[PDB]
Design a protein around this ligand. Structure first.
Ligand SMILES: OC[C@H]1O[C@@H](O[C@H]2[C@H](O)[C@@H](F)[C@H](O)O[C@@H]2CO)[C@H](O)[C@@H](O)[C@@H]1O
Ligand SMILES: *[C@@H]1O[C@H](CO)[C@@H](O)[C@H](O)[C@H]1NC(C)=O
Ligand SMILES: [Zn+2]
Length: 440
């Protein structure tokens, strides 16, 4: 895609800290950028949309290449259009924002400079942040996660992408998403079909795969952390239902693990650990620590374990133990993942796509920090916060993931009932294991 000039692109500032062993930290002058899929796209030199609602203008966009040549991404009004505000070390995302149009959700990336994403290298480090999920109901997900995107959003690979990271190009994730309007400097008009339940979305013939470490997928009721490996760790364009992932005829048919190896304390058998008034009390801000432990204790070792700690009201809270017979421990390891998938009768493509070692291979490439707020047009967030599938019995291990009702989370309802839901991420810190909190 091209660069539009109607609206200048100015990235809101957001600081974050790099820490050393001992706990000393230095502040980085980061800034955030909205994903290109949220932007106004118009014909170069004009105001006519290339895409409107969930359909393309096929005169301007008769094929993927001509469309990329003819269509320009515009700058964003972060607060007024998208409900995105930042101050100091804090980022607030609102769910619905009405301007001339009704915007729903957002997806933001952390930048190093105005043309380049920040590339985090998490092996043998911990990533820590504060969050306020107290305004997130059933059916919404404030996500903070990492994907193996290119640092320049694909500019240097794809000359037909003139916009790059400055305009939030280059997204990919372990669902191999086909809802992206531009992938690899090509539009996705070919094969496009509108969503039956999202007036703003559709899918095209191309998808964008890469590995994904889900640090945080949460609302006030449930949370989960989940590595998703792929055969290739970095961005790859896939075609058609062979992409696999959510929204394909077979989520398991492609090169990425769509499910991941997850740890949700409630799903792992503790119903009183995370939630309103619980050990980790979602009625107020808390700190979330996530550690990427390697086999040899160095940054070039193989990923062996992912650990989780919380801090709230100054008390350090270790992750809850998984309580199911034969699925023990309080962290993610290969033995946990194998045992958990067996007990829960979930297809284990985690190992097929490389397991923790494969996840680590992605971590070693460098990964982009994503902060988002979304509702779920496939599964109504029930996989996170309810019984899933909704036909199954809550007494069966793996089915119950939170206390939300099985008829919660339908996007039309969420969008009607919770337009002023929001999430606040703040106080990001990265450094050696134990360096960001009162360890160990
Ligand atoms: O596609 C929705 C999310 O799925 C999450 O994986 C689920 C499955 O969908 C279930 F079938 C399975 O029993 O449990 C796993 C874990 O909750 C996936 O982790 C997430 O990335 C997807 O958005
Ligand atoms: C839930 O986790 C908390 C904190 O670790 C613990 O105090 C409580 O006993 C746990 N419940 C179960 C059923 O293990
Ligand atoms: Zn015109």
């Amino acid at each position: 895609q091209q660069v539009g000039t109607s609206q200048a692109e100015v990235h809101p500032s957001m600081t974050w800290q790099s820490c050393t062993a001992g706990g000393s930290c230095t502040t980085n002058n980061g800034k955030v950028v909205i994903d290109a899929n949220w932007r106004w796209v118009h014909k170069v030199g004009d105001y006519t949309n290339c895409y409107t609602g969930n359909t393309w203008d096929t005169t301007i966009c008769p094929d993927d290449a001509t469309c990329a040549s003819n269509c320009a991404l515009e700058g964003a009004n972060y607060e007024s259009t998208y409900g995105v505000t930042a101050s100091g070390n804090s980022l607030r995302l609102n769910f619905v924002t009405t301007s001339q149009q009704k915007n729903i959700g957002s997806r933001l990336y952390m930048m190093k400079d105005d043309s380049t994403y920040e590339m985090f290298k998490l092996l043998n480090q911990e990533f820590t942040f504060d969050v306020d999920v107290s305004n997130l109901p059933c059916g919404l997900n404030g996500a903070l996660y990492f994907v193996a995107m290119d640092a320049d959003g694909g500019m240097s690979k794809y000359p037909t992408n003139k916009a790059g990271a400055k305009y939030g190009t280059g997204y990919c994730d372990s669902q191999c998403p086909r809802d992206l309007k531009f992938i690899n400097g090509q539009a996705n008009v070919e094969g496009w079909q509108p969503s039956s339940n999202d007036a703003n979305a559709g899918t095209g013939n191309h998808g964008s795969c890469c590995a994904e470490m889900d640090i945080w997928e949460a609302n006030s009721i449930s949370t989960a952390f989940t590595p998703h490996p792929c055969d290739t760790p970095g961005q790859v364009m896939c075609t058609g239902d062979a992409c696999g992932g959510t929204y394909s005829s077979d989520r398991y048919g492609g090169t990425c693990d769509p499910d991941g190896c997850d740890f949700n304390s409630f799903r792992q058998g503790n119903k009183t650990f995370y939630g309103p008034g619980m050990t980790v009390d979602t009625k107020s801000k808390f700190t979330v620590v996530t550690q990427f432990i390697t086999d040899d204790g160095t940054s070039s070792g193989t990923l062996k374990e992912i650990k989780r700690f919380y801090v709230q009201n100054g008390k350090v809270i270790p992750n809850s133990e998984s309580t199911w017979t034969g699925v023990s421990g309080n962290s993610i390891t290969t033995e946990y993942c194998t045992a958990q998938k067996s007990l829960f009768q979930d297809q284990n493509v985690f190992e097929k796509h490389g397991g923790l070692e494969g996840m680590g291979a992605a971590l070693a490439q460098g990964m982009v920090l994503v902060m988002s707020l979304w509702d779920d047009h496939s599964a109504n967030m029930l996989w996170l916060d309810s019984n899933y599938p909704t036909t199954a019995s809550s007494t069966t291990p793996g089915v119950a993931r939170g206390t939300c009702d099985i008829s919660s989370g339908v996007p039309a309802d969420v969008e009607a009932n919770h337009p002023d839901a929001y999430v606040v991420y703040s106080n990001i810190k990265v450094g050696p294991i134990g360096s960001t909190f009162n360890s160990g």
